[PDB]
Scaffold this active site. Sequence first.
Site, mmCIF file in Angstrom:
data_model
loop_
_atom_site.group_PDB
_atom_site.id
_atom_site.type_symbol
_atom_site.label_atom_id
_atom_site.label_comp_id
_atom_site.label_asym_id
_atom_site.label_seq_id
_atom_site.Cartn_x
_atom_site.Cartn_y
_atom_site.Cartn_z
ATOM 1 N N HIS A 126 -13.011 -4.935 -38.082
ATOM 2 C CA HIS A 126 -12.087 -6.056 -37.899
ATOM 3 C C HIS A 126 -11.575 -6.574 -39.229
ATOM 4 O O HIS A 126 -10.643 -7.375 -39.225
ATOM 5 C CB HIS A 126 -12.740 -7.128 -37.054
ATOM 6 C CG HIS A 126 -13.682 -8.074 -37.697
ATOM 7 N ND1 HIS A 126 -15.061 -7.993 -37.626
ATOM 8 C CD2 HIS A 126 -13.422 -9.178 -38.423
ATOM 9 C CE1 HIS A 126 -15.585 -8.998 -38.285
ATOM 10 N NE2 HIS A 126 -14.625 -9.748 -38.800
ATOM 11 N N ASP A 167 -17.916 -1.968 -34.614
ATOM 12 C CA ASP A 167 -17.250 -2.719 -35.664
ATOM 13 C C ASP A 167 -17.709 -2.275 -37.054
ATOM 14 O O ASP A 167 -18.520 -2.943 -37.706
ATOM 15 C CB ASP A 167 -17.462 -4.211 -35.487
ATOM 16 C CG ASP A 167 -16.568 -5.096 -36.345
ATOM 17 O OD1 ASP A 167 -15.612 -4.560 -36.946
ATOM 18 O OD2 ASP A 167 -16.868 -6.333 -36.368
ATOM 19 N N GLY A 194 -15.347 -15.130 -43.248
ATOM 20 C CA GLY A 194 -15.275 -14.740 -44.632
ATOM 21 C C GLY A 194 -16.479 -13.946 -45.097
ATOM 22 O O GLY A 194 -16.416 -13.291 -46.122
ATOM 23 N N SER A 205 -17.659 -11.702 -42.945
ATOM 24 C CA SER A 205 -17.326 -10.506 -42.197
ATOM 25 C C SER A 205 -17.319 -9.249 -43.041
ATOM 26 O O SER A 205 -16.745 -9.239 -44.113
ATOM 27 C CB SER A 205 -15.937 -10.624 -41.576
ATOM 28 O OG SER A 205 -15.945 -11.561 -40.544
ATOM 29 N N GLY A 206 -17.967 -8.218 -42.525
ATOM 30 C CA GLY A 206 -18.014 -6.979 -43.229
ATOM 31 C C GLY A 206 -19.132 -6.804 -44.224
ATOM 32 O O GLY A 206 -19.409 -5.707 -44.698
HETATM 33 N N1 LIG Z 1 -22.634 -15.138 -37.557
HETATM 34 C C1 LIG Z 1 -21.597 -15.867 -37.142
HETATM 35 N N2 LIG Z 1 -21.751 -17.050 -36.558
HETATM 36 C C2 LIG Z 1 -20.212 -15.281 -37.370
HETATM 37 C C3 LIG Z 1 -19.135 -15.536 -36.520
HETATM 38 C C4 LIG Z 1 -17.894 -14.998 -36.739
HETATM 39 C C5 LIG Z 1 -17.685 -14.171 -37.843
HETATM 40 C C6 LIG Z 1 -16.339 -13.577 -38.096
HETATM 41 N N3 LIG Z 1 -15.981 -12.780 -36.965
HETATM 42 C C7 LIG Z 1 -15.050 -13.111 -36.106
HETATM 43 O O1 LIG Z 1 -14.433 -14.174 -36.185
HETATM 44 C C8 LIG Z 1 -14.733 -12.144 -34.987
HETATM 45 C C9 LIG Z 1 -13.460 -11.378 -35.347
HETATM 46 C C10 LIG Z 1 -12.539 -11.357 -34.138
HETATM 47 C C11 LIG Z 1 -13.074 -12.468 -33.247
HETATM 48 N N4 LIG Z 1 -14.481 -12.718 -33.718
HETATM 49 C C12 LIG Z 1 -15.304 -13.647 -33.162
HETATM 50 O O2 LIG Z 1 -16.368 -13.911 -33.760
HETATM 51 C C13 LIG Z 1 -14.815 -14.241 -31.825
HETATM 52 N N5 LIG Z 1 -15.699 -14.352 -30.695
HETATM 53 C C14 LIG Z 1 -15.933 -13.304 -29.711
HETATM 54 C C15 LIG Z 1 -17.249 -13.655 -29.020
HETATM 55 C C16 LIG Z 1 -17.719 -12.920 -27.747
HETATM 56 C C17 LIG Z 1 -16.940 -11.663 -27.325
HETATM 57 C C18 LIG Z 1 -17.439 -10.293 -27.764
HETATM 58 C C19 LIG Z 1 -16.685 -9.794 -28.996
HETATM 59 C C20 LIG Z 1 -16.536 -10.763 -30.159
HETATM 60 C C21 LIG Z 1 -15.641 -11.960 -30.357
HETATM 61 C C22 LIG Z 1 -18.734 -13.904 -38.696
HETATM 62 C C23 LIG Z 1 -19.991 -14.450 -38.468
#
Ligand SMILES: N=C(N)c1ccc(CNC(=O)[C@@H]2CCCN2C(=O)CNC2CCCCCCC2)cc1
Length: 223
Positions: free
Chosen positions: A40, A84, A175, A177-178
């Site tokens: 992503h 991912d 931020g 992410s990855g």
């Molecule tokens: N550890 C955490 N709390 C955390 C949360 C978010 C992120 C960054 N990732 C994100 O924002 C990602 C990218 C696209 C939508 N994302 C999400 O996190 C959005 N939420 C859904 C939740 C449940 C459905 C299954 C698939 C996942 C998405 C990184 C870390």
Amino acid sequence: IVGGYTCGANTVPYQVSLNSGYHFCGGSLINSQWVVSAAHCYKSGIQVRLGEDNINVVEGNEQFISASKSIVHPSYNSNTLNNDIMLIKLKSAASLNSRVASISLPTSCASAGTQCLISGWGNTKSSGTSYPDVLKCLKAPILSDSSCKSAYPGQITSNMFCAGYLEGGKDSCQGDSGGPVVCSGKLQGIVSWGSGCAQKNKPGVYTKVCNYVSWIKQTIASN
Ligand SMILES: N=C(N)c1ccc(CNC(=O)[C@@H]2CCCN2C(=O)CNC2CCCCCCC2)cc1
Ligand SMILES: [Ca+2]
């Protein structure tokens, strides 16, 4: 990283920042020419920044190298975030040193209760936003399969695991992410998703790298 601590300069020498005129994701150096990140995080124009601590100041020890290849897993699903994972090839090899170093891939999967190190330059607030200049770190355990699936029913595939803290206050975030989840010296996870950040009963969800070691090797050898 919410509820973490300042790592200390170059104490996480495999941590990279992906930059497109701004930091937008993390990654992990796995050899002198290849980085593991999240699918992503894909976009054009990626510059890999290695050796970083303060991402807003040139301090010394940085290496900035353009991505020459960005390979999203062919089976990545952007709605479920299944698979991912992305491989980035660097246009030239990084120069490895104490501050710029690869992290080993797993030889076996990690188990529940294993303590890991999660790091990045993502948001430090569970409400609102604040982005740090220097790298942040969090020690966090892998959760059981049953608690993970309890937390996110019907959303956890066999290519995911949960790690962190159900009481709130300590998590990765936007931020980060990855970026890496490292357990006993092995890259076991990639920062992928979650509900909010550091919310009660909503731990972090990570790509399960042990399921991808053969794909990573097979992809690097052919590119
Ligand atoms: N550890 C955490 N709390 C955390 C949360 C978010 C992120 C960054 N990732 C994100 O924002 C990602 C990218 C696209 C939508 N994302 C999400 O996190 C959005 N939420 C859904 C939740 C449940 C459905 C299954 C698939 C996942 C998405 C990184 C870390
Ligand atoms: Ca810097």
